[PDB]
Amino acid sequence: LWIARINAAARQNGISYSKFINGLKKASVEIDRKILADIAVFDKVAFTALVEKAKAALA
Amino acid sequence: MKTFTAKPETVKRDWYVVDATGKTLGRLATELARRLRGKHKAEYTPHVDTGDYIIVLNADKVAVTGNKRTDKVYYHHTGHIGGIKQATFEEMIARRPERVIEIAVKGMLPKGPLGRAMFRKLKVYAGNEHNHAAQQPQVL
Amino acid sequence: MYAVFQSGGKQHRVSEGQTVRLEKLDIATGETVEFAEVLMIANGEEVKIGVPFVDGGVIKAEVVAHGRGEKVKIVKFRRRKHYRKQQGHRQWFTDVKITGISA
RNA sequence: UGCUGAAAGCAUCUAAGCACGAAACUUGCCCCGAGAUGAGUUCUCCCUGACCCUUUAAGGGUCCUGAAGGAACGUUGAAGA
RNA sequence: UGUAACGGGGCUAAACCAUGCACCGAAGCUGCGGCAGCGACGCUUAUGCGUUGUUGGGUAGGGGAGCGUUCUGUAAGCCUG
RNA sequence: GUGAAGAGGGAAACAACCCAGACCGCCAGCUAAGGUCCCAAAGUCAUGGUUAAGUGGGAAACGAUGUGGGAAGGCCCAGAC
RNA sequence: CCCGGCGAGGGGAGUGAAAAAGAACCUGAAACCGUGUACGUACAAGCAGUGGGAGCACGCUUAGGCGUGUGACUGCGUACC
């Protein structure tokens, strides 16, 4: 239910939650995505840029 | 200060015209259930009490691809264990949308719990742009 | 202000809540110790560049104010199933939260 | 039961493709059927005067020469548990 | 005597094998409370509070401890129409 | 290997039989073997083959112009099918 | 005084502190029942559940997460000795 707002729209853009996490968890500062990422079901129009961060390395 | 989603009855029913009919069917008939619970609408109540409405289009083109389709019997024997028996195979039965080869939910909510009242909500007609027996507000 | 606190309370991430934590090993019913344990509390979660994450520490701190967890709340099961019959046994523990978020 | 014809210039219903086929499975055959509440409908037919209470789409509640009508209405009966 | 060998349903690769890799994930060791035994410490000492080690399922046995419908007493003593 | 006066997460639901493993709580983390598209709650992942049969949860005494990988060999363009 | 069957029982009167002391005489619960405030509700499985909670007869709050139980959804499980 929580992690749906980190796949339900991202899978289309290709950003599939567990294969995007072997990407995320290369950074030793980001680990606690498991619940707190729930902000995505209403922060949408500004959450939509958090993928751009490192896209030319992370992608 | 609760995180769960009661009731919800029903918020998200996704009025999608299942162009998947035949062409890739055995890849998404297996997922009609995980649709009516999830993979997009998983955002709400991804296990309990909800409702759903895809927009059906055809029936007898189940596709299914393999030696199965021409000796796999369907049985029911609905009375006193039936006695005398029934054996018409999956492409020869699929010639009618009926009770076991058309719904997929019969295979996927299999005891009846979660499924116990919203049985016909998908319409269970078939017939394309000759007969749209479904929704009048704009489908998808 | 936003608890950056985790230890057995990490739901408390919110500005208020009011959300529970532990009641620790020692003196935990004196109201306050008046100092603040943290300063890396948030940045993005209150400014015009949002992220769900702790990239800064915006000059606000969290007070040490354990409160008054005194009146012994509901906790305690027993034991049966085969002859595993106990009806006392259950040494006490509980949860609490911080006094009032003045910031 | 063979058709053209190869696998393997042979031989050949089969391998691609063809065509019929019998208590059989299928079928508006016999016989009840959504009482299959998945709860869909056709056809033929029938009822449209005035208002009230507020926690309002929830209603709950009135008051129309009384209309054609209905089970009791007197014996019963063809079914009479 | 209803097809009844993954629980289903048989998925032409989702698979089988081989190389990578991230989530799920009993009670399972972690957050962090609480603490019955047997030991070791700071020291106290009638003896104990916390630290530190081993570790906390418990019908045959020995150890060791809690409370009562009231009888026999604390007690013309304090309590009650 | 601690079995019932042990209760149920192993290996199929063969409470005993692998063996250390549950006191007691959480809207707090997750360890192993099973898997991991599913009724089921995470990649239709990236990097390398084989298989094109429904193979996979039915083998033994044999067979067999269906093919697959490897390395040595036999006949051969003064002409081996 | 009143009522019916020139009856039973009641409804007030009243000796009474009392008729929950009324002559089927004990200041008084246990097996089972009659009408009601609300339910779940004539598609039922699986010791009739504690959960996790949606809003319902009702009763608080200048709003403030509740003081109430049949228990839509369904999760867990087989309470014995």
XYZ file of C-alpha atoms (C1' of nucleotides) in Angstrom:
626
model
C 0.000 0.000 0.000
C 2.830 2.457 0.935
C 5.328 1.435 -1.832
C 2.587 1.534 -4.557
C 3.241 5.392 -4.946
C 6.915 4.373 -5.756
C 5.910 1.943 -8.612
C 2.301 2.658 -9.816
C 3.512 5.609 -12.111
C 7.307 4.985 -12.222
C 7.041 1.489 -13.991
C 5.757 3.344 -17.110
C 8.882 5.645 -16.955
C 10.795 2.251 -16.298
C 11.859 3.066 -12.669
C 10.705 -0.335 -11.142
C 11.115 -0.243 -7.322
C 13.581 -3.196 -6.671
C 15.873 -2.782 -9.758
C 15.880 1.041 -9.150
C 16.962 0.187 -5.519
C 20.178 -1.685 -6.603
C 20.661 1.830 -8.214
C 19.636 4.033 -5.160
C 21.545 1.967 -2.504
C 24.905 2.713 -4.313
C 24.662 6.017 -2.388
C 25.578 5.301 1.392
C 23.308 8.333 2.418
C 20.004 6.827 1.004
C 18.603 3.614 2.781
C 15.148 4.268 4.409
C 12.926 4.383 1.209
C 10.802 1.472 2.718
C 7.973 3.692 4.170
C 8.852 7.472 4.146
C 8.737 7.630 0.293
C 4.858 7.544 0.761
C 4.925 11.417 0.089
C 4.735 10.534 -3.681
C 0.822 10.032 -3.697
C 0.241 13.795 -3.136
C 3.621 15.577 -3.706
C 3.407 14.398 -7.450
C 4.073 17.658 -9.353
C 7.328 18.326 -7.490
C 8.229 14.677 -6.570
C 8.416 14.236 -10.457
C 11.920 15.841 -10.566
C 13.631 13.693 -7.807
C 14.481 11.179 -10.681
C 16.667 13.841 -12.460
C 19.274 14.114 -9.603
C 21.863 11.716 -11.000
C 19.998 10.306 -14.190
C 23.115 10.728 -16.392
C 25.092 8.317 -14.001
C 22.276 6.469 -12.004
C 19.988 5.492 -15.013
C -3.359 8.765 12.557
C -4.232 5.374 10.960
C -2.488 4.444 7.700
C -5.072 1.886 6.290
C -7.941 2.523 3.806
C -11.401 1.584 5.106
C -13.810 1.064 3.406
C -12.910 2.060 0.604
C -16.025 1.098 -1.519
C -14.547 1.613 -4.199
C -12.565 4.861 -5.488
C -10.701 3.326 -8.520
C -12.325 1.014 -11.238
C -10.283 1.992 -14.364
C -12.683 1.862 -17.387
C -10.133 0.295 -19.745
C -11.078 -1.439 -23.059
C -9.124 -4.639 -23.002
C -7.401 -4.507 -26.403
C -5.290 -7.460 -24.876
C -8.121 -9.865 -25.992
C -6.518 -12.942 -27.565
C -3.251 -11.242 -28.757
C -1.364 -11.619 -25.404
C -4.345 -12.849 -23.182
C -2.479 -15.674 -21.184
C -0.064 -12.888 -19.867
C -2.878 -10.695 -18.385
C -5.828 -13.146 -17.743
C -3.316 -14.453 -15.095
C -3.269 -10.745 -13.892
C -6.961 -9.578 -14.048
C -7.018 -10.350 -10.252
C -3.696 -8.403 -9.460
C -5.329 -5.590 -11.647
C -8.726 -5.578 -9.739
C -6.539 -5.423 -6.509
C -3.465 -3.586 -7.790
C -0.456 -2.906 -10.111
C -1.848 0.610 -10.801
C -4.808 0.857 -8.231
C -2.520 -0.852 -5.560
C -2.339 2.771 -4.186
C -5.678 2.209 -2.139
C -6.753 -1.189 -0.567
C -4.569 -3.884 -2.229
C -6.227 -6.987 -0.524
C -9.920 -6.120 0.679
C -13.636 -5.375 -0.080
C -13.142 -3.257 -3.344
C -14.748 -3.246 -6.858
C -13.528 -3.079 -10.520
C -14.702 -2.520 -14.194
C -12.595 -3.235 -17.307
C -14.513 -2.828 -20.612
C -14.808 -6.344 -22.295
C -14.881 -6.651 -26.080
C -14.720 -10.382 -27.213
C -14.871 -13.868 -25.802
C -14.008 -16.995 -27.906
C -10.411 -15.798 -28.805
C -8.749 -17.041 -25.612
C -5.481 -17.660 -27.721
C -3.671 -19.744 -24.936
C -1.023 -21.364 -27.229
C -0.321 -25.101 -26.577
C -1.405 -28.761 -26.674
C -3.618 -27.937 -23.560
C -6.283 -26.151 -25.675
C -7.430 -29.480 -27.451
C -7.529 -32.060 -24.645
C -7.942 -30.033 -21.457
C -11.595 -30.916 -20.354
C -13.759 -28.535 -18.259
C -15.925 -30.182 -15.530
C -18.680 -29.041 -13.179
C -20.981 -32.161 -12.630
C -23.220 -29.673 -10.661
C -25.723 -32.246 -9.172
C -25.197 -35.769 -7.697
C -21.479 -36.020 -8.924
C -22.955 -35.899 -12.499
C -22.526 -39.625 -13.298
C -22.574 -39.220 -17.107
C -19.682 -36.961 -18.075
C -18.611 -33.845 -19.991
C -15.409 -33.373 -22.018
C -15.620 -30.572 -24.687
C -12.116 -28.984 -24.868
C -10.954 -25.352 -24.307
C -11.346 -23.984 -27.920
C -14.643 -26.010 -28.412
C -16.226 -24.794 -25.127
C -14.885 -21.130 -25.580
C -17.467 -20.885 -28.440
C -19.724 -19.575 -25.582
C -18.743 -17.189 -22.727
C -20.253 -19.366 -19.947
C -18.871 -19.924 -16.256
C -15.134 -21.215 -16.438
C -13.145 -20.183 -19.674
C -14.108 -16.431 -19.973
C -14.070 -14.838 -16.424
C -10.468 -15.660 -15.264
C -11.486 -14.509 -11.648
C -12.886 -18.101 -11.139
C -9.178 -19.218 -11.242
C -7.832 -16.295 -9.189
C -10.211 -15.600 -6.221
C -10.767 -19.320 -6.107
C -12.623 -20.140 -2.788
C -14.967 -17.102 -3.231
C -13.721 -14.703 -0.468
C -13.054 -11.148 -1.764
C -15.226 -12.249 -4.829
C -18.568 -13.017 -2.944
C -20.935 -10.268 -4.431
C -19.326 -8.244 -7.370
C -19.656 -11.200 -9.901
C -21.050 -9.546 -13.172
C -19.553 -5.986 -12.826
C -17.395 -6.528 -16.055
C -20.798 -6.962 -17.963
C -19.949 -10.589 -19.392
C -21.311 -9.613 -22.829
C -19.049 -9.915 -25.946
C -19.307 -8.345 -29.420
C -17.000 -5.282 -30.288
C -18.242 -2.124 -32.278
C -21.259 -4.151 -33.487
C -22.504 -4.351 -29.740
C -21.043 -2.057 -26.994
C -23.195 -3.334 -24.069
C -20.898 -1.399 -21.595
C -20.503 2.180 -20.107
C -21.727 5.420 -21.877
C -19.435 8.049 -20.163
C -16.064 7.882 -21.894
C -14.217 4.505 -21.707
C -10.349 4.307 -22.098
C 9.822 20.569 14.504
C 10.648 17.321 12.569
C 12.047 14.511 14.756
C 15.172 13.114 13.010
C 14.933 10.580 15.902
C 14.604 6.851 14.959
C 15.257 4.493 17.942
C 11.874 2.515 18.486
C 9.903 5.654 17.419
C 10.849 6.355 13.641
C 7.199 7.077 12.719
C 7.697 10.365 14.748
C 9.285 12.030 11.559
C 6.329 14.565 11.486
C 6.314 18.175 13.010
C 3.859 17.093 15.734
C 2.194 13.668 15.626
C 2.011 13.278 18.652
C 3.810 9.977 18.108
C 5.376 7.516 20.669
C 9.014 6.685 21.598
C 10.722 4.473 24.285
C 10.772 5.363 28.016
C 14.577 4.487 28.384
C 16.578 2.756 31.194
C 16.819 5.672 33.768
C 14.970 8.864 35.203
C 12.258 9.462 32.570
C 9.406 11.206 34.598
C 11.114 14.602 35.574
C 9.567 16.577 32.706
C 12.727 18.023 31.174
C 16.480 18.215 31.013
C 16.273 21.543 29.057
C 19.234 20.795 26.580
C 18.674 19.694 22.857
C 20.364 16.380 21.502
C 20.180 17.317 17.727
C 20.641 20.046 15.136
C 20.683 18.093 11.753
C 16.800 17.853 12.037
C 15.652 18.837 8.418
C 16.061 21.360 5.574
C 13.956 20.330 2.485
C 10.826 19.384 4.591
C 10.140 23.063 5.305
C 11.587 25.006 2.253
C 10.909 25.677 -1.537
C 13.089 22.646 -2.505
C 11.275 19.543 -1.165
C 12.844 16.092 -0.612
C 11.696 13.277 1.883
C 15.305 13.240 3.207
C 17.902 14.814 5.633
C 20.132 16.999 3.376
C 20.935 19.843 5.828
C 20.107 20.987 9.420
C 18.069 24.216 9.574
C 19.028 25.907 12.880
C 16.163 24.354 14.997
C 16.788 21.787 17.735
C 14.766 19.043 19.656
C 14.386 19.417 23.459
C 14.939 16.645 26.046
C 11.501 16.482 27.599
C 10.590 12.806 28.516
C 7.327 13.958 30.298
C 5.107 11.966 32.752
C 4.468 8.293 31.621
C 3.169 7.491 35.218
C -0.387 5.870 35.240
C 0.331 2.220 34.172
C -1.339 1.779 30.684
C -2.707 -1.542 29.106
C 0.050 -4.103 28.014
C -0.110 -7.631 29.575
C -1.023 -11.045 28.111
C -0.815 -14.387 30.120
C 0.010 -18.107 29.130
C -1.951 -21.376 28.387
C -1.961 -23.902 25.340
C -1.125 -27.415 26.654
C -0.232 -27.147 30.460
C 1.694 -23.813 29.877
C -0.744 -22.224 32.408
C 0.502 -18.879 33.801
C -1.859 -16.022 35.036
C 0.796 -13.658 36.478
C 4.323 -13.688 35.055
C 4.483 -10.565 32.769
C 7.160 -8.108 33.946
C 6.172 -4.586 32.884
C 7.350 -2.282 30.027
C 5.579 0.607 27.989
C 5.895 3.522 25.416
C 5.712 7.451 25.899
C 6.219 10.775 24.035
C 7.796 14.204 24.421
C 5.923 16.857 26.664
C 4.801 19.698 24.281
C 6.580 20.732 21.044
C 7.307 24.412 21.609
C 10.212 24.587 19.113
C -10.054 -44.875 -46.393
C -6.375 -42.105 -50.328
C -5.286 -36.796 -52.347
C -0.980 -34.161 -54.386
C 4.087 -35.231 -52.349
C 8.612 -35.059 -49.319
C 11.670 -35.958 -45.190
C 15.649 -39.966 -47.221
C 14.838 -37.945 -56.654
C 12.886 -43.971 -53.270
C 8.070 -45.595 -51.557
C 3.693 -43.284 -49.536
C -3.285 -40.616 -46.060
C 0.931 -36.335 -43.491
C 5.442 -34.090 -43.005
C 2.806 -28.090 -44.591
C -1.961 -28.919 -46.251
C -7.058 -31.691 -47.607
C -12.247 -34.562 -46.625
C -15.888 -37.482 -44.499
C -16.825 -40.179 -40.073
C -20.050 -43.724 -35.640
C -24.386 -45.172 -28.359
C -19.793 -41.553 -28.099
C -18.114 -35.270 -26.919
C -20.963 -31.324 -29.094
C -26.959 -30.215 -30.551
C -33.789 -25.547 -30.536
C -33.704 -33.921 -29.799
C -36.780 -35.753 -24.479
C -37.713 -32.567 -19.735
C -37.782 -28.618 -15.883
C -35.118 -24.165 -15.923
C -31.344 -17.345 -12.579
C -35.636 -21.272 -7.346
C -28.480 -20.717 -12.068
C -30.812 -13.642 -6.778
C -24.147 -12.870 -12.136
C -30.223 -11.515 -10.877
C -31.102 -9.388 -18.002
C -35.777 -8.403 -19.891
C -39.490 -8.436 -23.976
C -44.379 -7.807 -25.208
C -49.895 -6.667 -23.673
C -51.866 -3.838 -19.945
C -52.391 -0.091 -15.645
C -52.069 4.418 -11.794
C -49.722 12.005 -12.944
C -54.567 16.114 -6.597
C -53.089 19.438 -2.816
C -49.172 19.913 1.176
C -46.124 19.473 6.131
C -41.733 18.884 9.296
C -35.672 20.381 9.202
C -30.497 16.769 12.161
C -31.734 17.815 3.828
C -30.581 13.917 -1.632
C -31.472 11.615 3.780
C -35.891 11.555 3.994
C -39.648 10.806 7.363
C -44.719 12.466 7.617
C -49.721 14.184 5.883
C -54.515 15.402 3.824
C -57.971 14.385 -2.018
C -66.501 13.564 -4.330
C -63.229 7.495 -2.223
C -61.948 4.798 -7.894
C -62.270 0.304 -10.180
C -60.765 -3.588 -7.194
C -59.555 -7.649 -3.104
C -59.348 -11.878 0.760
C -62.911 -13.070 4.386
C -68.439 -13.267 1.981
C -73.013 -18.947 1.291
C -72.333 -24.002 -0.316
C -66.520 -26.444 -0.897
C -63.570 -29.362 -5.113
C -62.149 -30.823 -9.591
C -55.489 -30.357 -5.769
C -57.765 -30.448 -0.172
C -51.679 -31.501 5.022
C -18.343 -44.299 -7.871
C -16.639 -35.414 -9.939
C -10.178 -34.383 -14.183
C -8.297 -34.901 -8.588
C 0.965 -36.807 -7.892
C 3.343 -28.310 -7.692
C -2.356 -26.214 -3.392
C -4.240 -24.309 -7.642
C -4.380 -23.134 -12.846
C -0.334 -25.450 -17.183
C 3.470 -20.123 -18.302
C 6.491 -21.585 -25.212
C 9.280 -18.800 -22.344
C 7.552 -15.810 -17.633
C 10.570 -20.920 -18.002
C 15.757 -25.046 -17.671
C 20.420 -24.236 -16.465
C 24.716 -21.034 -15.580
C 26.708 -15.856 -14.202
C 24.663 -11.235 -11.607
C 21.486 -8.821 -8.100
C 17.323 -6.052 -4.851
C 13.120 -6.420 -2.347
C 9.489 -10.050 0.502
C 10.702 -12.460 4.533
C 8.137 -17.900 11.992
C 8.851 -16.372 17.329
C 14.427 -17.041 14.535
C 18.766 -11.525 16.479
C 17.958 -6.214 16.330
C 15.632 -1.632 18.282
C 14.409 -0.358 23.322
C 11.804 -1.229 27.764
C 11.475 -4.662 31.849
C 14.265 -8.370 35.111
C 13.572 -14.900 38.183
C 17.765 -17.776 39.105
C 23.876 -19.036 39.339
C 28.403 -16.266 39.037
C 31.813 -11.924 38.375
C 32.343 -5.941 39.963
C 31.943 -0.526 42.608
C 31.740 -0.843 47.041
C 28.491 -1.094 50.695
C 26.930 -4.437 54.380
C 21.223 -6.148 58.955
C 22.047 -5.902 53.630
C 21.476 -3.731 48.947
C 21.530 -0.543 44.158
C 23.265 -0.993 39.768
C 26.860 -2.637 36.551
C 28.584 -6.918 33.999
C 29.101 -12.532 32.544
C 26.190 -17.186 31.730
C 20.974 -17.030 30.276
C 15.813 -17.009 31.117
C 9.791 -23.023 27.322
C 9.325 -26.468 32.779
C 4.333 -33.076 36.115
C 8.171 -36.883 37.975
C 12.491 -35.031 43.089
C 14.777 -31.459 46.527
C 15.012 -25.987 47.235
C 12.282 -21.037 48.297
C 8.476 -18.148 48.844
C 2.310 -15.475 48.242
C -3.253 -14.796 50.046
C -8.138 -15.787 51.402
C -15.727 -17.062 52.430
C -14.072 -17.719 58.960
C -13.334 -20.604 62.927
C -8.982 -19.514 67.731
C -6.540 -14.921 68.856
C -3.968 -8.920 67.886
C -8.012 -5.471 70.852
C -14.970 -1.816 76.553
C -9.423 -1.224 71.436
C -11.361 1.866 67.106
C -15.111 1.405 63.435
C -21.021 1.180 61.869
C -28.346 2.627 61.132
C 20.167 -35.502 17.638
C 15.617 -33.911 23.738
C 10.320 -36.395 22.150
C 5.330 -35.884 25.858
C 3.206 -33.497 31.527
C 6.284 -29.091 24.130
C 2.141 -26.050 21.745
C 4.501 -26.113 15.754
C 8.140 -22.078 11.601
C 11.605 -27.660 9.058
C 11.852 -31.782 4.983
C 3.957 -32.436 1.923
C 0.091 -30.311 6.051
C 4.581 -38.593 8.034
C 1.879 -33.887 16.120
C 7.836 -37.948 17.838
C 12.414 -38.556 13.098
C 17.990 -34.304 11.309
C 18.438 -29.423 15.296
C 18.636 -25.515 19.282
C 14.495 -22.837 18.745
C 9.545 -20.085 21.300
C 10.017 -15.991 28.090
C 7.100 -10.991 26.983
C 5.793 -6.211 22.474
C 5.398 -2.593 18.727
C 1.077 1.357 12.645
C 9.488 -1.041 14.530
C 13.846 -3.766 11.866
C 14.327 -8.535 9.062
C 18.072 -14.203 9.340
C 18.280 -19.489 6.926
C 16.042 -23.517 3.331
C 11.157 -22.792 -0.060
C 10.856 -19.683 -3.359
C 10.093 -14.770 -5.620
C 4.139 -13.752 -12.683
C 0.630 -15.743 -9.391
C -5.019 -16.600 -4.897
C 0.700 -13.631 -2.467
C 2.023 -8.469 0.024
C 8.851 -6.845 -3.946
C 13.152 -6.810 -11.003
C 8.257 -8.622 -17.501
C 15.659 -7.264 -14.007
C 21.286 -7.540 -17.064
C 24.602 -10.786 -18.460
C 25.444 -16.018 -21.094
C 23.919 -20.529 -23.084
C 20.591 -24.862 -24.455
C 15.713 -26.226 -25.635
C 11.269 -24.998 -29.852
C 8.993 -30.816 -26.652
C 4.008 -28.667 -23.482
C 9.337 -30.509 -21.129
C 8.339 -29.754 -15.567
C 5.322 -33.673 -9.782
C 5.732 -42.075 -13.834
C 10.665 -45.399 -14.544
C 12.969 -50.835 -16.619
C 14.912 -55.100 -20.588
C 15.665 -53.213 -25.178
C 15.237 -49.691 -29.316
C 15.405 -45.182 -33.188
C 17.534 -41.866 -41.718
C 14.680 -36.337 -34.957
C 18.999 -33.277 -33.518
C 23.011 -30.821 -29.990
C 28.071 -29.932 -27.969
C 33.363 -31.751 -27.887
C 37.981 -34.145 -29.436
C 40.438 -37.952 -32.235
C 39.669 -40.753 -36.571
C 37.730 -43.283 -42.030
C 36.471 -42.209 -47.851
C 37.414 -37.436 -51.187
C 37.634 -33.788 -56.356
C 44.040 -38.446 -61.035
C 36.401 -37.901 -58.626
C 34.218 -40.534 -51.963
C 27.640 -39.858 -52.362
C -63.876 1.773 46.007
C -63.612 -0.615 41.164
C -63.573 -4.560 37.212
C -64.980 -9.586 35.635
C -67.565 -15.413 35.703
C -72.738 -13.377 42.744
C -64.806 -15.836 39.857
C -59.031 -15.071 38.926
C -55.838 -10.848 38.771
C -54.864 -5.824 38.918
C -55.243 -0.326 39.681
C -55.400 2.929 43.912
C -56.497 3.333 49.020
C -54.233 1.808 53.718
C -53.271 -0.814 59.527
C -47.531 -0.585 57.960
C -40.754 1.836 58.251
C -41.807 -1.576 54.240
C -46.342 -5.275 50.145
C -39.062 -5.379 45.326
C -42.587 -7.823 54.110
C -49.576 -10.300 50.951
C -51.844 -15.877 54.179
C -48.319 -21.239 46.164
C -45.773 -16.457 54.317
C -37.633 -17.523 53.108
C -35.721 -9.142 53.592
C -33.082 -13.548 47.790
C -29.191 -14.844 41.787
C -28.976 -20.343 39.595
C -31.250 -25.120 33.595
C -35.061 -22.468 30.013
C -38.322 -18.131 28.746
C -42.415 -12.944 27.064
C -42.455 -7.569 24.641
C -39.123 -3.697 23.605
C -33.898 0.468 22.152
C -30.301 -0.184 17.943
C -28.135 -4.310 14.874
C -25.639 -8.454 11.778
C -29.894 -9.508 8.629
C -33.885 -15.922 4.185
C -26.144 -17.374 -1.345
C -25.245 -21.043 4.432
C -18.716 -23.758 5.237
C -15.052 -24.295 9.656
C -15.428 -24.258 18.320
C -19.216 -18.552 16.010
C -13.411 -14.940 17.860
C -9.763 -11.029 19.638
C -8.232 -8.146 16.099
C -7.948 -3.802 11.978
C -11.778 -0.286 11.722
C -15.992 2.070 8.228
C -20.767 4.433 10.692
C -25.126 3.127 13.467
C -29.696 3.865 18.459
C -27.830 6.925 21.850
C -24.596 10.528 25.903
C -20.032 14.364 26.650
C -16.811 18.488 24.104
C -17.164 27.022 21.803
C -13.427 21.578 17.341
C -10.358 18.139 20.452
C -9.976 11.381 17.501
C -14.357 8.822 22.414
C -18.019 6.084 27.485
C -21.657 1.831 24.760
C -22.649 -3.787 21.821
C -25.359 -7.813 17.568
C -20.257 -7.844 14.947
C -20.904 -6.318 6.550
C -15.477 -6.835 4.545
C -11.922 -10.957 6.588
C -7.969 -12.957 9.085
C -5.845 -16.215 12.581
C -6.913 -21.415 13.533
C -8.098 -26.771 14.734
C -9.703 -24.501 23.299
C -10.088 -29.711 25.806
C -7.062 -33.374 28.484
